[PDB]
Amino acid sequence: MKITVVDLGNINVKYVGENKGRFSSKITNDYQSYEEGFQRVEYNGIKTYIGVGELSREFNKADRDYMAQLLYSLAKANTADTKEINLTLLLPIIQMKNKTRLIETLKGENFKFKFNGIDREIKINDLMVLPEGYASYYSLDIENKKGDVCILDLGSRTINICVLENAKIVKTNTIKLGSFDFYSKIKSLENAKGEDYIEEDIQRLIDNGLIKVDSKQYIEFLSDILNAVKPYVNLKTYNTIFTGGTSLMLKEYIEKLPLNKFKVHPNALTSNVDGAMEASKKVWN
Amino acid sequence: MKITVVDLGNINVKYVGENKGRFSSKITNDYQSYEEGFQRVEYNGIKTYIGVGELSREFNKADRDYMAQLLYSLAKANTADTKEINLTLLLPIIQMKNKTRLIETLKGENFKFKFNGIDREIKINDLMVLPEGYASYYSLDIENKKGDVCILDLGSRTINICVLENAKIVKTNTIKLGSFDFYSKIKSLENAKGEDYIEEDIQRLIDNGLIKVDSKQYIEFLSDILNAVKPYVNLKTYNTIFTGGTSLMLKEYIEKLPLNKFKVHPNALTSNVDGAMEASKKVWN
Amino acid sequence: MKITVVDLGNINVKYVGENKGRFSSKITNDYQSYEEGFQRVEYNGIKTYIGVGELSREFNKADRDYMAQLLYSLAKANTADTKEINLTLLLPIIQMKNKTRLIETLKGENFKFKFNGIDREIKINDLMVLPEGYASYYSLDIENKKGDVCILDLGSRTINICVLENAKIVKTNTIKLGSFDFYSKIKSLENAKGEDYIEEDIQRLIDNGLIKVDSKQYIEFLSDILNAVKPYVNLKTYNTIFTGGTSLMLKEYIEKLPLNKFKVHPNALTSNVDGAMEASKKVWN
Amino acid sequence: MKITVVDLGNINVKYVGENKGRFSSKITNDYQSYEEGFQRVEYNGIKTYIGVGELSREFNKADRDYMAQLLYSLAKANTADTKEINLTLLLPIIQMKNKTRLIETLKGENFKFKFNGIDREIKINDLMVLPEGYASYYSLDIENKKGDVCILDLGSRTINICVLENAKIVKTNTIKLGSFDFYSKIKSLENAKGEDYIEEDIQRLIDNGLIKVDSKQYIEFLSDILNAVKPYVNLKTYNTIFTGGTSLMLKEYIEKLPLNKFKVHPNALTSNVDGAMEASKKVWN
Amino acid sequence: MKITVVDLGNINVKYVGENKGRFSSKITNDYQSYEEGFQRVEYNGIKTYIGVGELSREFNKADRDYMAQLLYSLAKANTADTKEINLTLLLPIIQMKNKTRLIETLKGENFKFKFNGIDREIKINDLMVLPEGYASYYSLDIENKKGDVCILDLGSRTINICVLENAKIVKTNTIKLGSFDFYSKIKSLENAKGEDYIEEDIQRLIDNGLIKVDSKQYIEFLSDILNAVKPYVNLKTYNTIFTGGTSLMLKEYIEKLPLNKFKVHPNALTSNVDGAMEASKKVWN
Ligand SMILES: Nc1nc2c(ncn2[C@@H]2O[C@H](COP(=O)(O)OP(=O)(O)OP(=O)(O)O)[C@@H](O)[C@H]2O)c(=O)[nH]1
Ligand SMILES: Nc1nc2c(ncn2[C@@H]2O[C@H](COP(=O)(O)OP(=O)(O)OP(=O)(O)O)[C@@H](O)[C@H]2O)c(=O)[nH]1
Ligand SMILES: Nc1nc2c(ncn2[C@@H]2O[C@H](COP(=O)(O)OP(=O)(O)OP(=O)(O)O)[C@@H](O)[C@H]2O)c(=O)[nH]1
Ligand SMILES: Nc1nc2c(ncn2[C@@H]2O[C@H](COP(=O)(O)OP(=O)(O)OP(=O)(O)O)[C@@H](O)[C@H]2O)c(=O)[nH]1
Ligand SMILES: Nc1nc2c(ncn2[C@@H]2O[C@H](COP(=O)(O)OP(=O)(O)OP(=O)(O)O)[C@@H](O)[C@H]2O)c(=O)[nH]1
């Protein structure tokens, strides 16, 4: 019956199933006093509280206590009393160097937890994993897949690039770059003011406008990434579909690019799962 | 029907219900001669007289004979012949490590007393507890909750800090510091004069002016607390709402701070209960 | 209509009503020959003669045949043909451990007597009792009650201490010490001369100067009492109002004290009743 | 040469030196007629008679005319013609807030008296003070000090608690509770019979059996104290050595407790001084 | 002249200088009555008592009142009248994110204190800081540094890992894991018995044997940590030198491991400072 996609993302984690949505990738298993005021889950001796704590730009998100979080995300797309579901997962392209163990450490198994006191264990019917960013391919319609295209997922730490022909990949790339390197470059001198701010809290302070950043620096980042991608791809060729949340940093300037064929996908951040679902049906149905 | 908040505070206890107000947290069950000249209550073998005696900076205010006092406070916000009320209580953030027992030692139970000869037992409809200092959150209007803020309760022994985003907490802290450590630092040398005075009676002697204290020492305390809070919070960020009575020590200098967005809440001392009441309705109504 | 205060004092008893004054607390129901030359009253089989006899420093002045005396005192403040009056009484702080019975043994009752042949019984409208020494509080004006003060009744056997804030008590104490312990300490060696004199007749012999006492011994007593009171009160704080007759032993040296704010109340001996009357009106009016 | 411990206790005072023993803590300097029939001592204008009078549950036993008594106790452990001895004293844990003055008001000084006409002044070689209740520690043998223990002095007004590891303290506590609060709770209704009896004379009437008390009320007191001590100590841990005279109220039920390791020390009342003596040697020898 | 290493450790703090040793990291500036019975120091308004109180697993040990403690530790390795010494300090690897301020808040400065009344201020000649755990490197002899090795400091909250080639680091890691997570996992169900015990007091109760723990659970913890470390290091490679006190939890099973080359360093707990001293000489000499 039931199908689910959980995408682990860069800044957020992502659930779609009986319910849809996402939430922050931040994790705390560090100090904890007010159990009742925070989302919480305990499993196999790991007690974690969801959407707050430490994130520290680390690799191995698929091994460092994300389990709880992942389970939580599945509970988000699922009901509070679920026991069996079929699983589509995703990981960024490069990180797939860790697929195997994960799969057999999860495949068709049941896992416990305490979350918020609901405290139930859930079995999974089957796991099938896709490259994060790539799955947007299937969300594409033949309106552009009939021609060569470029799935271009601007994630906050990353840019994942899938250069595709009609009904097939042509090339792939991924460079750990994105809005964080911009935040850090901006902080290299804005924090040198004598101010205590970081790339982690920066986006909030621009959201409220307590501090602001020049647009031409956004343009500098755009130019840098364009220069980086030139050797592999001719962006004018391979009509480019921008996905991920970092595309929403810059849609305003991306639309201003001199390129011939491109577009920031509506709900660009969530498009990849939208295609991962075409794939999900193609397996289960 | 009826709702009540009793906040146990640092120096005072706090009642709001059929009646509103507060009174000193001082307790005597030590010598007692003139029963008629003091507020008095006896319950379960504990005879206590209200607003005078020993306070001694002790933890466990929620276990050391405060019962009588607490009951008294409820009688203050209530009529003299009450028998059933619904209870919202509060405790400082850290002290919640003692919630559980208290709740089930009180939940939906009836308790006796002798107070001043009125000598009635009263049932409670339900208890629901909030972190003291945090509840000011709800007293906030969207005029500032729409932006990230910092509930900053300067209590006499404590500073409780709740760093909040729009409609949610971001971080929390609490350091047992306040006007008492200032009194003690001042007494470390002013009492070294060869004078018999203490942090307990000091505030009275400055109220009458029998002895006075330099303002720059208030500024030293302000600088010390600001240095203490720096690692967690950027005070310029998270527009700071000062609450509690110790904020009334220093409003005159707090307004002089170089911060961008801040304010000493009107009735800052009582704001936390004012929000605890938004919460009270959100449960009962 | 009518109000009366009878204060039982240490050495004297005290009447104010239709008439004002006081007289010695000495009692004789021991030998009696010349009925006509002494004040006399018989009631309920107790025949007593007023202002002479035995006093012997005994407690329970409110149970040992003072009745006659008390009645006499009421007759002093009253007319010789009185039948109904409203009663304010007073007892020293500690002695209130005996209030209850007295009250209901007197409340709203009529009592007979023979005094000097006038031999009438009188009803009392109501009794209301105050701590002797404390009532001086009400005789105070806002000129000093606006600040923290100390009602300090030096009675001959006692020092009663009421430490007050604005419009309320802060602490209380009472130590059975006074000019008698000075007389006894002086007699411990002056009577050791081989001389037949006692603390009872001593004050007369210094009044006529037949024997005299060094002032520095008065100062020794002052220093001793000051050392005794130190743990409870900072005399420089709580502006001290001296009351009672033993304050008139030492006014000359009390004015010489190094204290910041103090005063021997004019008519210090009678001030306590002067305030007991503010209280009397506050009940009856 | 000579060593002495005088322990001031709750109900009794305690002397060990050239002689050993104890006697009641009751004091009278109030009326006195038959000098010859009572133990008596006069010093510095204070005339007192030993083991009878007023006790009134008051703090400051180390300032309120105990001097005479204390001297008497030293005379008890000493000969009738002593002039120089070395002093170990003790006070309850909390009361040590008064150490300093006492020490320098006594240290290496000579003090007079009249006692019973022996009327000699005695010098003291040195004072060294220990927490009453704690000194039982040293009376312990390595048979249990090798393991963590709990010196548990049940004094009549108090329970003093010293939680110790091997050769060191771990925690301490003291709550003014004991057999008096039981007497008062029992009197709250047994005296409400319409009977004239008090906690002061109660123990005698149960000693002669003129009135008796249910054992289950002893058990109620035991349960109350056990509930009180739970937050600090796990009684099963820290093998508990009961000391003081109130432990002799209940040894019969203490032995019935479900605890794993505990014992009422033989001569439990006097054990603390027995250890204070190990300490005494460790100073003098 | 003089050199000192103070290592702040996980459970203890560590001093070597004119004197050597360590003591508990526990801190109390909370209630304090018996000043004389506890180690004590006051500096800049902070009064602290050493080796007892609150520890609460908190970060920022290098900012939360450890100053006093740190000073105390220096006094431990130093004489009681020291005024100038050269400083080598250490902090855990991760915590170095706080180096800078500490250094310049201490570098070449003089600091006061009251400790136990010795109450002297001491200057420091220079500070130089090393990663705790890493310094064991220098304590190594060429007998194993000639080959690739792994400094493996099992601290109670932590495992610090320094993977080294000949005369140089190859990689580093640190995971906040250790005997505490074992205590907490054991308490998750052993305290669920209905028993009042915690990870803080657990080790004592196993030291005295009042409660005991299965060895296979130690083996479970060992297996968990080994699984955790696999991605970074091949333990068979990089001959592993176990250091810290948590290595002394398990030496008995560590020796049983199937590894080819490893050893629990003699005085494993103190080895890191032993190498920090090779470094100390390499600076000063
Ligand atoms: N301006 C704007 N930025 C957004 C929005 N949603 C997400 N983002 C940005 O997305 C960035 C986070 O990384 P992403 O670009 O989303 O990369 P990702 O792999 O999709 O990571 P996930 O968000 O977890 O799916 C942050 O810089 C966000 O500010 C949005 O609605 N508006
Ligand atoms: N100057 C001034 N200080 C006040 C006033 N009201 C309360 N305070 C101060 O408040 C301090 C007591 O602790 P609080 O700051 O009130 O902390 P709290 O947790 O709110 O404790 P509670 O007063 O019981 O609610 C004392 O130092 C008081 O002087 C006021 O109206 N004026
Ligand atoms: N020198 C002097 N002493 C007075 C005078 N009036 C009363 N006394 C003293 O008062 C002492 C008696 O005890 P009080 O001090 O009056 O104590 P009290 O509780 O007020 O007792 P009462 O006199 O009955 O009201 C005696 O030592 C008197 O000498 C006075 O006018 N001059
Ligand atoms: N049943 C019984 N009770 C005793 C005995 N000796 C002392 N007590 C009790 O001890 C209580 C008095 O207080 P304690 O428990 O002795 O406390 P303390 O601090 O040791 O006071 P001291 O007796 O002066 O040393 C009273 O309730 C006595 O009844 C005894 O031999 N038998
Ligand atoms: N069994 C045993 N354990 C020890 C010994 N010494 C220290 N420990 C353990 O060490 C642990 C505390 O943390 P450590 O492993 O020492 O970590 P650390 O960073 O070295 O902290 P410090 O002890 O302060 O140096 C506790 O679990 C102790 O039981 C010992 O001699 N025997």
- Asked if C touches A (at least 3 Cβ pairs < 8 angstroms), the answer reads no
Which residue out of E28, E30, E65, E119 would a mutagenesis test of the B interface target, given it has the greatest number of B Cβ atoms within 10 Å?
E30
Question: In this structure, what DSSP letter does residue A244 have?
Answer: S
Structural contact between residues A147 and A131, judged by C-beta atoms closer than 8 angstroms: no
Question: What's the N-to-C CA distance of chain B in angstroms?
Answer: 10
Pair of tokens at residue E109: 């400065």
| B6, B11, B134, B174, best to mutate for ligand 2 pocket (most atoms within 8 Å of CB) | B11
Pair of tokens at residue D201: 């004379």
- Tokens 């009752």 belong to which residue? C109
How many Cα atoms are found within 13 Å in the side-chain-facing hemisphere of A15?
21
Type of residue found at B76: K
Three-state DSSP state, C269: helix
Type of residue found at E140: L
| Angle between helix C199-207 and C179-190 (nearest 10) | 90
Which residue out of A28, A33, A52 would a mutagenesis test of the B interface target, given it has the greatest number of B Cβ atoms within 10 Å?
A33
Query: D146 with D268, same domain?
Result: yes
Dihedral (CA of E127, E130, E133, E134) sign: negative
How many Cα atoms are found within 13 Å in the side-chain-facing hemisphere of D5?
29
Residues D155, D153: Cα–Cα separation, whole Å: 6
Pair of tokens at residue E275: 């190498």
Q: Is B197 near chain C, with CB under 8 Å?
A: yes
Residues E129, A271: Cα–Cα separation, whole Å: 50
Chain E residues closer than 8 Å to D169 by CB = 37
Task: Determine the Cα angle at D199 with ends D194 and D203, to 5°.
Answer: 105
Chain C nearest C-alpha distance from D45 (Å): 6
Phi, psi of D181 (to 5 degrees): -60, -30
Chain D residues closer than 8 Å to C188 by CB = 45
Pair of tokens at residue B194: 């060869």
- Asked if E touches C (at least 3 Cβ pairs < 8 angstroms), the answer reads no
Q: Is E285 near chain A, with CB under 8 Å?
A: no
Which helix (H) or strand (E) segment holds residue D122: the answer is strand D122-132
Give me the count of residues in chain B: 285
CA E57 to chain centre: 13
Q: Measure Cα distances from C69 to A32, A192, C75, C114, E7 in Å.
A: 74, 92, 10, 12, 83
Q: Judge: B31–D58 Cβ closer than 8 Å, yes or no.
A: yes
Is the minimum distance from the CB of B8 to ligand 2 under 6 angstroms? no
Query: Which parts of chain C fold into alpha helices (H)?
Result: 66-77, 99-106, 136-139, 142-145, 179-190, 199-207, 215-229, 247-254, 271-284
Number of C-beta neighbours around residue A191 at 10 A: 15
Residues 6+ apart with CB under 8 A from C143: none
Number of C-beta neighbours around residue E192 at 10 A: 8
Closest CA to E128 of E256, E276, E285, E12: E276
Query: C115 with C25, same domain?
Result: yes
Residues E87, E5: Cα–Cα separation, whole Å: 6
Which helix (H) or strand (E) segment holds residue E75: the answer is helix E66-77
Query: E166 with E121, same domain?
Result: no
Resolution of this structure in Å: 8.6
Number of C-beta neighbours around residue B105 at 10 A: 12
Query: D44 with D123, same domain?
Result: yes
Query: B141 with B264, same domain?
Result: yes
How many Cα atoms are found within 13 Å in the side-chain-facing hemisphere of E248?
12
Residues A190, C134: Cα–Cα separation, whole Å: 70
**C153 CA → ligand 3 middle, Å:** 10
- Where does residue A5 rank: exposed (0-12), middle (13-18), buried (19+ CB within 10 A)? buried
Query: C169 with C96, same domain?
Result: no
**B239 CA → ligand 2 middle, Å:** 22
Pair of tokens at residue E54: 């609150």
Residues 6+ apart with CB under 8 A from E118: E75, E80, E81
**3-class SS letters over chain B:** CCEEEEECCCCEEEEECCCEEEEECCEECCCCCCHHHCCEEEECCEEEEECCCECCCCCCCCCCCHHHHHHHHHHHHCCCCCCEEEEEEEEECHHHHHHHHHHHHHCCCEECCCHHHCCCCEEEEEEEEEEECCCHHHHCCHHHHCCCEEEEEECCCCEEEEEEECCEEEEEEEECCCHHHHHHHHHHHHHHHCCCCCHHHHHHHHHCCCCCCCHHHHHHHHHHHHHHHCCCCCCCCCEEEEECCCHHHHHHHHCCCCCCCEEECCCHHHHHHHHHHHHHHHHHC
Instruction: Determine how β-strand C239-243 pairs with β-strand C262-264.
Output: parallel
* Residue of chain B whose alpha carbon sits nearest to that of E42: B188
Q: How many domains does chain B have?
A: 2
**E113 CA → ligand 5 middle, Å:** 29
Phi, psi of A175 (to 5 degrees): -125, 130
Residue nearest to atom 13 of ligand 2 (CA): B156
Is the minimum distance from the CB of D6 to ligand 4 under 6 angstroms? no
Residues 6+ apart with CB under 8 A from E135: E90, E272, E273, E274, E275, E276, E279
Query: E139 with E266, same domain?
Result: yes
Chain A residues closer than 8 Å to B237 by CB = 197, 201, 204-205, 210
Residues B271, B140: Cα–Cα separation, whole Å: 9
Is the minimum distance from the CB of E186 to ligand 5 under 6 angstroms? no
- Where does residue A75 rank: exposed (0-12), middle (13-18), buried (19+ CB within 10 A)? buried
Dihedral (CA of D61, C199, C264, C12) sign: positive
**3-class SS letters over E213-266:** CCHHHHHHHHHHHHHHHCCCCCCCCCEEEEECCCHHHHHHHHCCCCCCCEEECC
Closest CA to E204 of D241, D264, D163: D163
Ligand number nearest to the C-alpha of D206: 4
Q: What is the CATH number of the domain that holds B125?
A: 3.30.420.40
Q: How was this structure determined?
A: cryo-EM
Query: C108 with C151, same domain?
Result: no
Residues 6+ apart with CB under 8 A from E142: none
Closest CA to A86 of A108, A64, A111: A108
Residues E203, D193: Cα–Cα separation, whole Å: 54
Type of residue found at A272: N
Long-range Cβ contact pairs of B19-23 (< 8 A, separation 24 or more): B19/B76, B19/B77, B19/B78, B19/B79, B20/B77, B21/B76, B21/B77, B22/B270, B23/B50, B23/B51, B23/B73, B23/B76
Phi, psi of E164 (to 5 degrees): -125, 145
Structural contact between residues A182 and A190, judged by C-beta atoms closer than 8 angstroms: no
Chain D residues closer than 8 Å to E52 by CB = 170
Residues B43, B113: Cα–Cα separation, whole Å: 4
The interface residues of chain C toward chain D in range 85-124, judged by CB-CB distance below 8 A, are none
Domain, as residue range, for E194:
134-273
Structural contact between residues B35 and B85, judged by C-beta atoms closer than 8 angstroms: no
Closest CA to C21 of C83, C89, C74: C74
Structural contact between residues E93 and E132, judged by C-beta atoms closer than 8 angstroms: yes
Q: Judge: A45–E185 Cβ closer than 8 Å, yes or no.
A: yes
Query: CA torsion angle for D53, D59, D60, D65 (degrees, to 10)?
Result: 0
- Asked if E touches D (at least 3 Cβ pairs < 8 angstroms), the answer reads yes
Ligand 1 — pocket residues by CB below 6 A? A 9-12, 14, 25, 154-156, 179, 203, 244-246, 248-249, 269
Ligand 3 — pocket residues by CB below 6 A? C 9-12, 14, 25, 154-156, 179, 203, 244-246, 248-249, 269
Structural contact between residues B139 and B271, judged by C-beta atoms closer than 8 angstroms: yes
Residues A258, A262: Cα–Cα separation, whole Å: 10
Pair of tokens at residue E117: 């009344």
Residues E85, E123: Cα–Cα separation, whole Å: 7
Beta bridge partners of C110: C123
Residues E135, E123: Cα–Cα separation, whole Å: 25
| Angle between helix E179-190 and E215-229 (nearest 10) | 130
Residues 6+ apart with CB under 8 A from C43: C67, C68, C71, C111, C112, C113, C114
Pair of tokens at residue E243: 């250091």
Query: A125 with A156, same domain?
Result: no
- Where does residue C169 rank: exposed (0-12), middle (13-18), buried (19+ CB within 10 A)? middle
Closest CA to E160 of E185, E140, E137: E137
Buried b (16+ CB within 10 A) or exposed e, A35-55: eebbbbbbbeeebbbbbbbee
* Residue of chain D whose alpha carbon sits nearest to that of C58: D31
Q: Judge: C148–B204 Cβ closer than 8 Å, yes or no.
A: yes
Ligand 2 nearest atom to the CA of residue B133, by list position: 19
Phi, psi of E6 (to 5 degrees): -120, 115
Closest CA to D127 of D64, D65, D70: D70
Q: What is the DSSP string of D17-29?
A: SSSEEEEE--EE-
Three-state DSSP state, E9: coil
Residues C142, C164: Cα–Cα separation, whole Å: 13
The sheet that has B122-132: what strands, in order across it? Answer: B20-24, B12-16, B3-7, B84-92, B122-132, B110-111
- Tokens 């500098």 belong to which residue? A220
Instruction: Determine how β-strand D46-50 pairs with β-strand D27-28.
Output: antiparallel
Three-state DSSP state, D255: coil
Which residue out of C138, C146, C148, C171 would a mutagenesis test of the B interface target, given it has the greatest number of B Cβ atoms within 10 Å?
C148
Which helix (H) or strand (E) segment holds residue D136: the answer is helix D136-139
Question: What's the N-to-C CA distance of chain A in angstroms?
Answer: 10
Task: Determine the Cα angle at B152 with ends B151 and B154, to 5°.
Answer: 145
**B265 CA → ligand 2 middle, Å:** 13
Which helix (H) or strand (E) segment holds residue D155: the answer is none
Type of residue found at E160: N
Residues D280, D88: Cα–Cα separation, whole Å: 7
Instruction: Determine how β-strand D239-243 pairs with β-strand D149-154.
Output: parallel
Query: CA torsion angle for B162, B166, B168, B170 (degrees, to 10)?
Result: -50
Q: What is the DSSP string of A126-153?
A: EEEEEEETTTHHHHS-HHHHTS-EEEEE
Q: Measure Cα distances from A192 to A181, A197, A198, B236 in Å.
A: 16, 10, 11, 17
Chain B residues closer than 8 Å to D184 by CB = 45
- Where does residue C18 rank: exposed (0-12), middle (13-18), buried (19+ CB within 10 A)? middle
Residues C123, C102: Cα–Cα separation, whole Å: 15
Residues C3, B273: Cα–Cα separation, whole Å: 48
Query: B269 with B140, same domain?
Result: yes
| Angle between helix C247-254 and C215-229 (nearest 10) | 90
Query: D138 with D259, same domain?
Result: yes
Longest dimension (CA), chain C: 59
Q: Measure Cα distances from D285 to D3, D127, D281 in Å.
A: 10, 15, 5
Q: Is E256 near chain A, with CB under 8 Å?
A: no
Residues 6+ apart with CB under 8 A from E113: E41, E42, E43, E68, E71, E119, E120, E121, E122
Query: D176 with D241, same domain?
Result: yes
Residues A191, C58: Cα–Cα separation, whole Å: 83
Q: Measure Cα distances from D277 to D96, D100, D155, D243, D274 in Å.
A: 19, 22, 20, 16, 5
Structural contact between residues E78 and E19, judged by C-beta atoms closer than 8 angstroms: yes
Q: Which partners does chain E have (≥3 C-beta pairs < 8 Å)? A: A, B, D
Structural contact between residues D140 and D241, judged by C-beta atoms closer than 8 angstroms: yes
Q: Judge: E181–A45 Cβ closer than 8 Å, yes or no.
A: yes
